[PDB]
């Protein structure tokens, strides 16, 4: 039996599935620890590993990219879970090594790979605590090329009056996604700051794990996965919307929650987003 993790319903994905909007022919790069392509509830279209020691992007050593991938696009069938965009074309972009880290250069390599291979949506369920002009150039170039660029806001919680949003989440060109729970309360770990754009489910998120497994993870990574999947649903109904139109559709149709510094625009509503972009007109 297939379970639809609550987060998928909480963002109103199923209303769009019933209308025939499932992310078909939308290319989503999961820029992360890779994706297990042997998983019965995931169909991996392609991808690349930018990790020196790790030539296979379909070998997920961190059990992270696979979980992100399953929130984006777990298949609609009689097993496992269900993705926000279950028909999306899923790309494994491995930029995190088995040791648990990656260089920004490997992230930029993934971003450049994603532009060159015509990804519609980049999800970066990862980040670091400091900026680089190079990383900003790279996400700015992705946005200039018409890619919808989604990143996890970071898991740094509150730090007095300061933005704790990670990079590349912090860059204006990137959609920075924070984490709420099933009550639409901000998760205590969710990074805060004026760079926060939207919230999505980020606590106790059931998804696919390597070796035909499922499990719950928490983090702004899980939240970003919902938003990247949401972007794919939107583009499967409005394929000519610009990345700016897709971003505005999500930001301008949210369920308003608390202060913008903690919740940005609030919880995404992909059903409302898919009606209209609300960019200018």
């Amino acid at each position: 039996a297939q379970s639809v993790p609550y987060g998928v319903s909480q963002i109103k994905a199923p209303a769009l599935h019933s209308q025939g909007y499932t992310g078909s022919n939308v290319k989503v790069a999961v820029i992360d620890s890779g994706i297990d392509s042997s998983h019965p509830d995931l169909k991996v279209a392609g991808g690349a590993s930018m990790v020196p020691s790790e030539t296979n992007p379909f070998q997920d050593n961190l059990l992270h990219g696979t979980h992100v991938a399953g929130t984006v696009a777990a298949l609609n069938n009689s097993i496992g879970v269900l993705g926000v965009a279950p028909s999306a074309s899923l790309y494994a972009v491995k930029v995190l090594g088995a040791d648990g880290s990656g260089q920004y250069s490997w992230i930029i390599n993934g971003i450049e790979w994603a532009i060159a291979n015509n990804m519609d949506v980049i999800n970066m369920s990862l980040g670091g605590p400091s900026g680089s002009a190079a990383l900003k150039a790279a996400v700015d170039k992705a946005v200039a090329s018409g890619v919808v660029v989604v990143a996890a806001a970071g898991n740094e919680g509150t730090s007095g009056s300061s933005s704790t949003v990670g990079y590349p989440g912090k860059y204006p060109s990137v959609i920075a996604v924070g984490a709420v729970d099933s009550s639409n309360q901000r998760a205590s770990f969710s990074s805060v700051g004026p760079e926060l754009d939207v919230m999505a489910p980020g606590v106790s998120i059931q998804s696919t794990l390597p070796g035909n497994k499922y499990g719950a993870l928490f983090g702004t990574s899980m939240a970003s996965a919902h938003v990247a999947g949401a972007a794919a649903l939107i583009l499967s109904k409005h394929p000519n919307w610009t990345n700016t139109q897709v971003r505005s559709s999500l930001e301008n149709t949210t369920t308003k929650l608390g202060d913008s510094f903690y919740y940005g625009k609030g919880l995404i509503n992909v059903q409302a987003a898919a009606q209209h972009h609300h960019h200018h007109h």
């Binding site: 990862l126 670091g128 806001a153 970071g154 983090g219 970003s224």
Partner: peptide, 4 residues
Amino acid sequence: AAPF
């Protein structure tokens, strides 16, 4: 970077 690291996973978020």
